[PDB]
């Protein structure tokens, strides 16, 4: 059935509660049988499921949402396969002790319009491995895709030994309905994502929470490095799904000695600079009411240039600007979710690093940071960058997110998402969620 208004939301939350208490007595041997026939049926339906999120939403390319739906559905069935989280964990018998486990309860959820399908396959293959449930609450612009993918996983789980109504989803939502699925008494988690619009209200609700955020991560180029290579990698990892992948590049800090050779090189391959009157036209589009617009998020390169008024060739990839001020006021440091960028000028190496600490803490959270240089003639400079920045990843001569297929990049790096926090204040690092946060453990003693 459909769930429209609050008068029956208190009926959906009661059915699952009748089932979770039937789930929390299974044994370890017939829960690792659901986890198999629920991952395969998400990977074997990777290409009716991306093509249906492009026609409604209006952004994204069909060719890149197919090699991202397959990476977040087999990394999560290659590491959490044999990790005991049911019944008994360990047993030391010098005097008699054991360490049984139990689950929490009912896990709420929130989903944005950017990746409407990848971050729903990931929250329904750990909430189905640690003996609990979930409830979704999607965005209006993509209400048809998210509800779809949380049905394929269900109807394939029913027919292997599961109960009936373990997962549910709102349809036809709004704001006024969502605030009742965070103060209801019988749910005790929230996994929120998106920009800094909803994650900030989640932490302040009288309940525990974690959040999968994104902060503007910088790029640093010094003099000793190669130029013919570290301009054509940044240019690849930004036109990947038109620059909506979490933890992409947003700013390019560069020293002065080679600033007049890492400018025209952009203009030849795929770039188109701007330094005049056009700079104020683009500067009045990505900032409308003190927040980000929803008119360009995901769109290609040349179309936003049409919103301002001027024209650009068709085969362009990115729009580069250039400024020198770095705080709130100038709108190029806020994350944008668009194929744009911003390049700064700096004197020497030791001052560039000083011009990146101030960008990270603006966004609230640290996710990544990357540095291009030589790694066999400066062992003392790659280690000085590991005692001054504050994130969880530090990349050296490597793009931020990942490549496509047609290459041999490093394989055992976790995805950009599935990486959250516990606060918003300042100087807070992230860490990777998984089946150890949803498991409280006990002890008995004879």
């Amino acid at each position: 059935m459909a769930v429209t208004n609050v008068a029956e939301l208190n009926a959906l939350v009661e059915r699952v509660k009748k089932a979770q208490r039937e789930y929390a007595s299974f044994t370890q041997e017939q829960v690792d049988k659901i986890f198999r026939a629920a991952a395969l049926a998400a990977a074997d339906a990777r290409i009716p499921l991306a093509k249906m999120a492009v026609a409604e939403s209006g952004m994204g390319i069909v060719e890149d949402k197919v090699i991202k739906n397959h990476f977040a559905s087999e990394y999560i069935y290659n590491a959490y396969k044999d990790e005991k989280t049911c019944g008994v964990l360990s047993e030391d018998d010098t005097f008699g002790t054991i360490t049984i486990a139990e689950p929490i309860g009912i896990i709420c959820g929130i989903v944005p319009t950017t990746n409407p399908t990848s971050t729903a396959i990931f929250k329904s293959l750990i909430s189905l491995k640690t003996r609990n449930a979930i409830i979704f609450s999607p965005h209006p612009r993509a209400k048809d895709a998210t509800n779809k993918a949380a049905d394929i996983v269900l109807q394939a789980a029913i027919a292997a030994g599961a109960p009936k109504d373990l997962i549910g989803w709102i349809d036809q939502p709004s704001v006024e309905l969502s605030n009742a699925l965070m103060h209801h008494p019988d749910i005790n988690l929230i996994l929120a994502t998106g920009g800094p619009g909803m994650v900030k209200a989640a932490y302040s609700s009288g309940k525990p929470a974690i959040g999968v955020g994104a902060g503007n991560t910088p790029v640093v180029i010094d003099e000793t490095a190669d130029i013919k290579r570290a301009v054509a990698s940044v240019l690849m990892s930004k036109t990947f799904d038109n620059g909506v992948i979490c933890a992409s590049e947003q700013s390019v800090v560069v020293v002065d000695s080679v600033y007049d050779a890492v400018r025209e090189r952009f203009a030849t391959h795929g770039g188109y600079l701007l330094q005049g009157k056009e700079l104020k036209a683009v500067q009045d589009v990505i900032l409308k009411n003190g927040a980000l617009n929803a008119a360009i998020v995901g769109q290609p390169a040349y179309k936003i240039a049409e919103l301002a008024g001027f024209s650009v060739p068709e085969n362009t990839k990115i729009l580069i600007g250039e400024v020198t001020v770095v705080d709130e006021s100038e709108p190029f440091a806020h994350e944008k979710l668009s194929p744009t960028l911003a390049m700064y000028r700096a004197k020497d190496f030791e001052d560039a690093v000083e011009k990146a600490e101030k960008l990270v803490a603006m966004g609230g959270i640290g996710h990544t940071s990357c540095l291009y240089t030589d790694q066999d003639n400066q062992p003392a400079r790659v280690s000085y960058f590991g005692q001054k920045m504050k994130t969880a990843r530090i990349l050296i001569n490597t793009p931020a997110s990942q490549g496509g297929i047609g290459d041999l990049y490093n394989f055992k790096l976790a995805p950009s998402l599935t990486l959250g926090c516990g606060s918003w204040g300042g100087n807070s690092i992230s860490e990777n969620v998984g089946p150890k946060h949803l498991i409280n453990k006990k002890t008995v003693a004879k």
């Binding site: 069909v62 496509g404 297929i405 047609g406």
Partner: peptide, 27 residues
Amino acid sequence: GANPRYPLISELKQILLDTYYGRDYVE
């Protein structure tokens, strides 16, 4: 994995639709 140029779908039904009538692909 091979095939150096990263293909795209809109240019992979033009090959199947020009080697059926007998024409030759060209840009």
